[PDB]
Chains A and B, each alone.
Chain A
Amino acid sequence: RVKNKNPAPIQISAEQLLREAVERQDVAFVPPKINITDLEELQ
């Protein structure tokens, strides 16, 4: 009936906001490492 004015059992908290905002980050970008197969690219 989408009219559930009943106060939520879990109220939104500020620390929750900052935590779930930070959660948007992931691991450091992983690039496929370059393979030095010969001497010139090593140089």
Chain B
Amino acid sequence: QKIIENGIRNNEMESEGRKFGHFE
């Protein structure tokens, strides 16, 4: 459960990491 959940959270933050690192 926790490994799946950590995978999920990493996935949304990397999906939003495109906006975060859009210009760098």
* Interface set of A (CB-CB < 8 Å, partner B): 33, 35-39, 42
Number of A-B contacts (CB under 8 A): 18
Q: How many residues of B contact A (CB 8 A)?
A: 7
User: A36's closest neighbor in chain B, by CB?
Assistant: B11
* Interface set of B (CB-CB < 8 Å, partner A): 4, 7-8, 11-12, 14-15
CB contacts (< 8 Å) of B4 on chain A: these are: 39, 42
- Tell me, rounded to whole Å, the shortest Cβ–Cβ distance linking B17 to chain A: 10
Complexed CA–CA distance, A22 and B15 (Å): 35
What are 12 A-B contacts defined by CB distance under 8 Å?
A33-B14, A35-B12, A35-B14, A35-B15, A36-B7, A36-B8, A37-B12, A38-B8, A39-B4, A42-B4, A42-B7, A42-B8
